[PDB]
Amino acid sequence: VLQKILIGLILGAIVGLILGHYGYAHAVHTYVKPFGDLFVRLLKMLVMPIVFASLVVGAASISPARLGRVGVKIVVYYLLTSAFAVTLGIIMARLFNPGAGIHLAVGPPLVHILLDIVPTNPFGALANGQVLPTIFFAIILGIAITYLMNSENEKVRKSAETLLDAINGLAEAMYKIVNGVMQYAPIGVFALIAYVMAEQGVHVVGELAKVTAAVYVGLTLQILLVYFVLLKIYGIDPISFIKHAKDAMLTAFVTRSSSGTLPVTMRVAKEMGISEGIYSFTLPLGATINMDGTALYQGVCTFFIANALGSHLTVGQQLTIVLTAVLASIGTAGVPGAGAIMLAMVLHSVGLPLTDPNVAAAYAMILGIDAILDMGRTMVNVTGDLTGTAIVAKTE
Amino acid sequence: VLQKILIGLILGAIVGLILGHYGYAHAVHTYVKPFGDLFVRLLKMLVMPIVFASLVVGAASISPARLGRVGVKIVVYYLLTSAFAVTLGIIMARLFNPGAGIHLAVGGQQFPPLVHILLDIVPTNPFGALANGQVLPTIFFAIILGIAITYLMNSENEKVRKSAETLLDAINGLAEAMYKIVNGVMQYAPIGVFALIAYVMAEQGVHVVGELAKVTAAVYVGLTLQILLVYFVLLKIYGIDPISFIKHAKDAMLTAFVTRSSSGTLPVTMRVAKEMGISEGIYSFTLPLGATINMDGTALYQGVCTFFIANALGSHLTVGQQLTIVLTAVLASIGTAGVPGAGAIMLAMVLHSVGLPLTDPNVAAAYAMILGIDAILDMGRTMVNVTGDLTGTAIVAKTE
Amino acid sequence: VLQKILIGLILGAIVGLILGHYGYAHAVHTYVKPFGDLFVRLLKMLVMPIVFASLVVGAASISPARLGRVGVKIVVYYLLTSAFAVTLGIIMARLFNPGAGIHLAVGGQQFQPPLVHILLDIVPTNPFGALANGQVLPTIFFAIILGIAITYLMNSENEKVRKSAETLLDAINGLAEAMYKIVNGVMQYAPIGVFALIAYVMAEQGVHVVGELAKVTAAVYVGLTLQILLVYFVLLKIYGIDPISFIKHAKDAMLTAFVTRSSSGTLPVTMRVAKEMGISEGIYSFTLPLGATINMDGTALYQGVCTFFIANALGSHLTVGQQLTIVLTAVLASIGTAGVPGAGAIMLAMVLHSVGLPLTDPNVAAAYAMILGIDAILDMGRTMVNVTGDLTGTAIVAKTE
């Protein structure tokens, strides 16, 4: 069964939590966290081909619409889900008030980012991660192929259908393998939370426990208040959605890599019957743009620091968190650290840099339990993609 | 229309030239030169696949000849076109005499095994070579693959011949698809172009005065006379209509001028070779090769710079052994890469050949004057570097 | 003919040996060793595709067995071949006793991996990366996984799935095939390539094989010869395969491996000898690349006979007892040692700190620098046996399945 995951997740959360309370953070890290990393190694392996392949073959569907409309749909969808997510985490940090005790001890060109979506060598872009420029190209290829196939010349249309196939052969094959790599997941998962529990979990106490609640409640309320709602309204069964997306949420949670989860996310989109036309473009894009769980986490962390330091958090202009949280979320990468790291950009937005070494002394507190906040946050980052995809998949 | 390029090129050259006279070199650079770079990003994207694919499928044609003869032809073609080009630039710099005023201010200054270059043509990992630019080793391998494919298809075993034809197809699928795209990316060209000369005009253009204007003339007149005196002529004699050639190569010459990347123009140069009906067997090998070997417009620029410096410093430019420019210019040209600066950079090698290095900090004070308007000289020089590939390809395409 | 190789190897060994006795180590290196390197460049070129392709198509054959059994077989084969090889080189260095004269001159001086963070590295994180940056091993791991997913994709109820899948599998074979076509052409260069390659090593390190260095060399090559006759010829004979047909077939791989000293660079030529002696891509296209970095038999001997050379010149008792700890670590070091044309030297260090005599104690570091003075001589021999052991094992296991 795939409750062997929950058997691993629960057993591991427990076995983990215990062993780290007894100073064996290092019996774990040296002994258990390779099996958790192995699992990840595998899932990374599949991300590059599965993404490329499935997007070329996902330029099956209509050039100007689908893509055009679907992009714009999903983009618009993504923005509002994220712009909401922070506001929800603002409200969570006005509710829980994480910062009384005084912070104890002390001690990119934007444009030259947009241009970087258009690769300069697509084999480069392939061989060095780089989902986003890959996406951009994989699309352009898959479209040129469509047009090649409706050529009058039938040597053109011969080879073109040829190519398009092998590419699908691959995309398909990746999907075949994401099934096998899921067998490891119970062990993979067990080992992964075993670590984070026996490590940062035995540190979630006092005001750190306070902030953690303010996050995860916010994350829960993102789902029920936004996803379940937006699903319900759009006529899709929320509860069927969860049942199907169980596998991606668990990987995303446990891995904390949105980008690492992508194959498993994409195979959940396949096996809930959406078109490669949609999912194979919305998913990778969203996998780095729709960080809903980050925008909450960042909105609730800006507050945590500005409370321990005791600014008024502008009773007025804290929309400039909301704004910058969005912006930072969009920027934050899909690796299992960067929301912390990027939180900085929404901090210098509220005017409290990691230079004023009390700020830097709270932020370092936060960072002490990031991988805890990460799991939750990540899982919601991914879910937001599936929701959005699914919603837009039903609109088209 | 593709006169929207000329509408962009002329509007941009003007809008540019003006704004840079009014100290807005930075309103441009921050606001207009991304659109120009976007265009380039795109064209870079295509170069790697288009080059690889088209050459494997361009090992359609006859193994020993075609390739063999065509290589040798185009190589021989390339050498003499370049060896001429410098001599034409020598004559331009004896004509215009760019160096009376003494290289005034001093102080603002500047800092390969040959064999371990030839060996570097044979790649050690063809996916490496692919994923890291590297046209030349790619070419080498793409050929070798394209040939092994031909031979695989005439195998007695028909599972061998099944899969082989299969592979060769998808590869063509791609090569084809790239060509489809170089058509789309051409749509951007008018904006792309407008922005790209908007920059160079509003930047180094408002600096082309006095003896800098003098050297520019002696280059561009030399570049014009490379066309009329060598291309138009070598085209006419070989029976191809010059004026149909220019009409067809209007797109590659405009990209190359505006981009200044020989190598970045390659897809558009290769889709001009296709749509003037030459064989992938020829063009998909002569074009990439020449795109980094047949720098004619460089060898002129370098011959006419060596003279500009040795005039401002006032050496006799050896009344006798300035053939050692001619020789080294060739050698430098061959070497100079297809990126949008290196003719300047490489000019150094022909300077230390005439015996005046960038150490003697008056030399390095002229050479830094030159470098002040290089992108002006680059547009010109680059366009001629590409044209010379088309000319030679076309000429040799007609001989075979 | 392919005796134009032997005509080049012999002419070159001679022309080389002579010119380096007359201080023209640099007339050679500047003039002859490019043609030797060109040859290598080419063979490198083919390695990546040939390996990848042939393994995906090599996941023709049965998923659970073949692979399963063949792996375990070849793995088990490999261990014992190597574990023997050192013991043979132990015995060679008890026989020839290379270390009387005290390590003269001190002051040559060199400096001094997480295992688990090696195993994890076999599973690539981006297969295009792995491909584009050498990295045979993770490539293997993935190429298999691909080739198997392909097999299963082809027996799908959906026949659009089974359409494109067979499509893909074909082009991949188109390539594999095409590489093999080319390893034939690149063999044409071999006589020149070979001539130039030994021309170098002879006119360079060969005019240095004198005295105790000649002593150790003998103790190596005799050990290497006796690895063949005593182990290969034997294990071949017993398994019913004709040794002398095997040698006839593997003549081309052995000569490249010897002359190139790159086990990994020889791989196309080795893999095309496996093809043209009629083994399945199912076997050879997995056992050959794996072994090309794991089955270093000629290394484990060289390393066992080098530990002894140094421990003799320094005069330790070489533990009359626990020198099995060489045997053990030599295996481990052999397994680790890469297929590039130096690393047995470099890795010998790990079996030295195992016997407790590091390159810090600068007389150790003054012997090890003597060894290294003639490594490329020991390398040719050692390497060729590293490859042979792959063919032997492949062939043996190829006949078992």
Ligand SMILES: N[C@@H](CC(=O)O)C(=O)O
């Ligand atoms: N690990 C997170 C990123 C973050 O920490 O912000 C994710 O992939 O969603």
Ligand SMILES: N[C@@H](CC(=O)O)C(=O)O
């Ligand atoms: N940018 C030129 C090189 C040069 O300026 O010499 C070209 O690529 O053609």
Ligand SMILES: N[C@@H](CC(=O)O)C(=O)O
């Ligand atoms: N050159 C050897 C490695 C070594 O010298 O240990 C080989 O490839 O087999």
Ligand code: NA
């Ligand atoms: Na996401």
Ligand code: NA
């Ligand atoms: Na993000």
Ligand code: NA
């Ligand atoms: Na050129």
Ligand code: NA
């Ligand atoms: Na050049």
Ligand code: NA
């Ligand atoms: Na080996």
Ligand code: NA
């Ligand atoms: Na090894």
